[PDB]
Each structure stands twice: as structure tokens, then as C-alpha cells.
Amino acid sequence: TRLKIVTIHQEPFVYVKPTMSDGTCKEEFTVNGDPVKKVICTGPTVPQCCYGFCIDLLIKLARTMNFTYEVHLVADGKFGTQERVNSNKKEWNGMMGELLSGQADMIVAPLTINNERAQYIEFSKPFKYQGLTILVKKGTRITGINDPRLRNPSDKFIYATVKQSSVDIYFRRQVELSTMYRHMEKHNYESAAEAIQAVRDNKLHAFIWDSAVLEFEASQKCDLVTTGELFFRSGFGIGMRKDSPWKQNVSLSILKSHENGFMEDLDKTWVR
Amino acid sequence: NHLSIVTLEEAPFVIVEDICVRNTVPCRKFVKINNSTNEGMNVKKCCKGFCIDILKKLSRTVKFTYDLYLVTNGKHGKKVNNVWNGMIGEVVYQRAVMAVGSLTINEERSEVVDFSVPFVETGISVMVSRGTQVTGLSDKKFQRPHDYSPPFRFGTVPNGSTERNIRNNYPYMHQYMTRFNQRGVEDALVSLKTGKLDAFIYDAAVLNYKAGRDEGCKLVTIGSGYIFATTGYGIALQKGSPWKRQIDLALLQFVGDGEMEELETLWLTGICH
Numbered sequence: 076t077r078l079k080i081v082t083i084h085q086e087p088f089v090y091v092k093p094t095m096s097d098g099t100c101k102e103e104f105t106v107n108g109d110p111v112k113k114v115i116c117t118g119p120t121v122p123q124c125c126y127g128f129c130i131d132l133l134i135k136l137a138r139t140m141n142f143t144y145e146v147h148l149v150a151d152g153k154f155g156t157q158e159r160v161n162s163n164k165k166e167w168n169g170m171m172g173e174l175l176s177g178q179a180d181m182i183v184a185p186l187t188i189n190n191e192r193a194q195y196i197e198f199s200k201p202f203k204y205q206g207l208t209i210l211v212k213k214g215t216r217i218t219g220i221n222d223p224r225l226r227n228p229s230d231k232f233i234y235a236t237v238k239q240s241s242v243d244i245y246f247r248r249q250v251e252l253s254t255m256y257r258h259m260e261k262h263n264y265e266s267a268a269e270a271i272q273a274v275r276d277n278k279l280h281a282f283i284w285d286s287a288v289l290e291f292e293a294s295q296k297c298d299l300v301t302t303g304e305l306f307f308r309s310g311f312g313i314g315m316r317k318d319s320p321w322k323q324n325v326s327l328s329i330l331k332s333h334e335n336g337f338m339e340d341l342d343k344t345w346v347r
Numbered sequence: 348n349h350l351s352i353v354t355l356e357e358a359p360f361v362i363v364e365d366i367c368v369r370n371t372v373p374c375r376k377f378v379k380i381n382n383s384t385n386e387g388m389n390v391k392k393c394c395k396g397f398c399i400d401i402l403k404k405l406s407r408t409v410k411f412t413y414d415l416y417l418v419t420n421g422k423h424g425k426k427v428n429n430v431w432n433g434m435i436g437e438v439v440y441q442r443a444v445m446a447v448g449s450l451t452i453n454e455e456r457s458e459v460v461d462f463s464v465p466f467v468e469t470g471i472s473v474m475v476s477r478g479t480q481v482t483g484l485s486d487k488k489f490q491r492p493h494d495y496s497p498p499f500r501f502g503t504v505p506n507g508s509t510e511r512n513i514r515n516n517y518p519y520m521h522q523y524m525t526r527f528n529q530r531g532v533e534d535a536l537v538s539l540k541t542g543k544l545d546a547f548i549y550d551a552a553v554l555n556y557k558a559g560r561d562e563g564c565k566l567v568t569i570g571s572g573y574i575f576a577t578t579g580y581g582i583a584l585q586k587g588s589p590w591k592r593q594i595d596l597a598l599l600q601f602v603g604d605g606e607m608e609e610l611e612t613l614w615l616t617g618i619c620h
């Protein structure tokens with residue numbers, strides 16, 4: 076066997092750094108003395124170094140269930156939505172497309188659990204509960220998702236999310252969001268890092284995204300702040316194909332890890 | 348296609364009333380003649396509440412009919428000497444196809460039943476009087492109480508999963524807090540409000556609901572980011588149940604399209620913050 080794991084760049088869940096000249100990962104500790112476990116991950120391909128919340132989780136899952144793995148970064152850089160072809164056919168892009176096509180056996184990433192994806196793949200019980208919030212630069216003042224500059228949009232105030240993500244789907248599917256969606260679809264970004272950098276450079280005025288990521292970004296970059304409130308709650312899950320022999324034990328392992336304070340440790344190490 | 352389903356009274360998730368009409372559904376309860384016999388009478392009751400509204404939506408969406416009954420031996424589900432009681436027991440021993448209510452998803456139970464996706468978030472939370480500053484269960488004030496003077500007065504309701512978790516994860520905290528055991532949630536709320544207790548550690552969904560409707564809005568819970576052992580209430584099904592996938596998809600549809608939020612507004616969300 077040896078499971079092919081697909082992941083995606085998304086601090087603080089997955090950090091991606093260059094290897095050292097000899098191709099190994101540099102030994103590093105957290106500020107409080109915790110070792111930073113790194114694995115080789117290949118991606119856009121060049122061997123690189125990956126670590127973070129999701130990597131620590133993968134390593135725990137691996138040891139617990141006694142599997143081995145090789146990690147790669149999603150080739151197209153996207154989380155995964157289903158899109159029309161050319162055809163009557165539809166096709167998943169991103170990590171979803173790689174799992175379904177067999178290029179990966181497991182998705183270990185901050186992958187939002189939703190109905191759309193669950194039609195086609197199996198999710199574990201959530202390894203992380205969080206939600207959607209909004210990120211702006213300090214000095215930008217909005218009330219949140221119901222602010223008139225959002226609910227009554229114009230090109231004076233630009234807001235957006237990441238293309239081909241669960242957040243994109245969240246806005247496309249709901250009739251009452253139809254006005255917001257039309258604005259955003261003109262402005263969505265290729266990745267969260269690009270959208271975040273864009274908010275810092277005043278090219279994007281609001282970025283709607285996962286609170287676990289946004290609150291972290293705001294805690295590191297003092298020129299950025301969030302609304303505060305979640306306007307929607309969601310969870311991240313491990314993704315597997317429906318025939319996976321690992322799915323029961325992955326979920327039990329996640330439940331066990333929440334209950335024994337392992338996830339508490341990961342939250343304190345990476346997320347708080 | 349017609350299913351035996353078990354539930355358990357716990358407001359506001361499941362509220363039981365005498366006989367049905369309105370937003371209620373019939374639910375039967377086997378009521379014992381006395382404590383020294385198995386003999387009893389089936390009594391007609393009516394059930395409503397957050398989890399009952401979920402059940403009504405599932406029956407419609409997933410297309411099943413059901414006979415709902417209230418569990419009579421134990422509560423949610425406890426394994427004693429490798430024998431299950433409560434709602435979990437009803438499913439495990441095949442008297443029910445499904446269990447609906449404020450049923451916490453955990454590893455021990457997931458070994459013997461299947462759970463749906465979580466439909467309400469929960470975990471181990473902390474409630475204090477407004478003004479008191481604690482981060483969550485892992486706070487040093489709880490872990491090492493004698494590092495402070497005076498030591499924090501804090502307890503939980505014993506004999507359940509909250510106590511069991513603390514006993515497993517923070518053995519000294521567990522040892523210390525038994526002197527502040529609370530008989531139930533209502534007792535604990537009063538202890539906090541009258542300054543007899545500084546913190547109450549318990550199920551997050553329950554504490555959020557109590558804080559939301561506290562008189563004077565004096566009781567406060569920690570932020571959701573500090574909830575320990577995050578999990579959810581879920582629907583329990585028989586292992587390898589054919590209903591699991593469609594139930595899972597429906598719940599995820601309800602959450603994604605705003606139906607779950609309006610149920611929350613209807614039953615759970617209080618006037619306080």
C-alpha cells in the first residue's frame with residue numbers, strides 16, 4: 076500500500092518551506108519547546124517541507140492505524156468544487172478531484188464538510204470546529220455579513236473569497252445571497268494567501284473565509300482584523316473515497332484525540 | 348420503512364407533555380407500576396423541541412415513518428460492566444433503529460452504534476458569573492487550583508461523561524473538584540449566582556442555552572474556541588444502518604441551507620450575551 080496524502084498550503088494547518096541543501100527538513104522547536112514534526116511533501120514538482128496542525132494530525136493517524144504515507148500538494152492549488160465540462164458531464168477540481176481520480180487516497184487538510192462534497196466522498200467526524208468570518212484592514216469599518224456595503228455592493232468596496240472553495244459554493248447555492256455572489260464572482264482569488272496580501276495592500280477590502288485561518292492571520296499581522304463573529308459554523312474533516320478501508324478507524328481516532336486532549340494540544344500549539 | 352425511534356426528555360431538545368396537536372408528535376412512555384416489578388402501562392405523551400423538529404424534517408426529507416418512544420432504563424447511554432443502557436442501549440440491543448435527542452457523539456459509543464454528522468456543536472465548556480476570567484477547562488486555575496489564593500471553587504455534575512473526561516485528563520483537578528460536586532444543572536446555576544461557586548464545568552450546548560436565558564444575563568460561558576473535547580450531538584443508528592447516508596446528507600443539507608440556524612433561533616438562542 077502506502078497512502079498517497081494530498082494537502083494544500085494553508086497556515087496554520089499546513090506550512091510549506093524549502094528543504095535544506097541536503098534535501099532534509101531543518102530541525103525546529105516551538106517557542107514553548109515543542110518539537111516541530113516535518114514531513115517531505117512534493118509540489119509545484121519539487122520536494123518541500125510541510126508541518127503544522129494537519130501534519131501533526133496525519134502523523135498521529137498514521138501511528139495509531141499503522142499506515143505509511145507520502146504527501147503531495149494539490150497540483151491545481153484548489154480545495155475543490157464541482158464544475159460543468161465543455162458536455163453534460165461534471166468534474167471536481169482541487170483536492171476533491173485528486174481524491175476521486177485516485178491521485179490521492181486521503182485528503183488531510185482544512186477541508187470543509189458540506190453536502191455537495193459528501194454526496195461523492197466520505198468525511199471523518201470533524202477534527203476541528205470553526206466557521207466563516209470576514210477579514211479587513213485596520214481602519215476599515217463594517218458590522219459584518221449584514222453591513223450595507225456587503226448586502227448592497229458596488230465597486231467602491233470590493234469583497235471576495237477563494238475560487239473553487241466551500242465558501243464559493245456557500246454563496247452560489249443560496250438564493251438570498253444572490254446579490255453578494257454576483258459581486259464576489261467578479262473578484263474571487265486563487266488562494267487565501269493572495270487574498271490576505273491583497274487586503275494588506277488595500278486592493279481587497281474584505282475577505283470572507285475560514286475563521287480558524289483568519290483569526291490566526293489577524294493574531295500575527297497587527298494591521299489586519301476580523302469582524303469577530305462567525306456568521307456560519309462548519310467543520311473540517313479528513314476526506315476519503317467511499318470504499319476506503321480506513322474510514323471507521325480514522326473517525327474513531329479523531330474522536331479519541333478530541334477526548335484525550337490531543338486536539339487541545341494541537342490547538343494550543345498551532346491555532347491559539 | 349417504518350422505524351422504531353427512541354428519545355429522552357431534555358429541554359429544549361426534547362420536551363415532553365401530557366396528551367397531541369400543534370408542533371408536537373406522539374411519543375409513548377412505558378410507566379412502571381412500582382420499583383420492584385417489570386410490569387407497567389404504556390402511556391401516551393407528546394414530544395416537541397429542537398430534536399423533534401429535526402426528526403420531523405428527516406422523516407419528510409428521507410421519507411420514513413416512525414413510532415417514537417421515551418427510553419425508560421437509564422438516560423443517554425452508559426456502559427456498565429460492558430452492558431449499555433439508555434438510548435444507546437435501545438439501539439445496540441435492536442429495540443430502536445435510531446436514537447434522537449441531546450446525544451453526544453463519542454468514541455466509546457461509536458464503537459457500538461453509527462452516528463450521523465453532528466447537528467449541534469458541544470463539548471466541555473465553563474460557565475462563570477460575568478466578570479470572572481477563565482480561559483477554559485485547561486486553564487491553570489483549574490489544573491493547579493492551589494497555585495492561587497483563594498483557590499477557585501468549581502465543580503461539575505458527577506457520574507457522567509464530563510467527570511469521566513476530567514478524571515482521565517486532569518487527575519489532580521478531578522481530585523480537587525469532587526468537594527464541589529453539583530447535584531444537577533439547576534443547583535449549579537443557583538450556586539454560581541449566589542456566589543457559592545466560581546465556575547461550573549459542563550456540556551457546552553446545555554450551558555450556552557442556560558446562559559442565553561439567565562435572568563439578568565449574569566451568567567457567561569467561555570468562547571467556543573476554548574471548548575475542550577469539541578464534538579456534537581448526533582443521531583445514533585444501528586451499526587451499518589442503511590439509513591445513515593441519507594440522514595447524513597439531509598442534515599448537511601439543513602445546515603448548509605439555513606434550516607438548522609432557524610431551528611436554533613427557534614429553540615436555543617436566548618436573549619442574553
Ligand SMILES: N[C@H](CCCP(=O)(O)O)C(=O)O
Binds near residue numbers: 451452507
Ligand atoms: N449529552 C449527554 C452528556 C451530558 C454531559 P454529562 O452529564 O455526561 O457530564 C450525553 O449524550 O450523554
